[PDB]
């Protein structure tokens, strides 16, 4: 149908929107301590702590897949990196630190995105 159409360009552009914010928000850890999943070979009992393990990598893959409906669900992805990382590392380390420079910086991109998203459509 023409409507089905319309709606896959909807989706398209969304996804094309949310490359250059998934772009910006990873530029925020030059470090790419969330680049990856976190390995268990290297950390075995990772699952035990974390149910919902997430990483750009990760993301990266269900964007390209066009896997992302709205902006919600893409945030809700990008909030996994950061509340996983601030559970299992302790407040001293350069991990959870990591983790707090990327929420506050991504916040910023993330309050435009939204703006974006409502203003498109």
Known sequence: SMEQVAMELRLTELTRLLRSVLDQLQDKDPARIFAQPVSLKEVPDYLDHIKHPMDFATMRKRLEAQGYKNLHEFEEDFD????????????????????????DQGGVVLRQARREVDSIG
């Open 80 to 103: 996994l990196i950061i509340d996983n990382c601030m559970k299992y590392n302790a407040r001293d380390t350069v991990f959870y630190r990591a983790a707090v420079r990327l929420r």
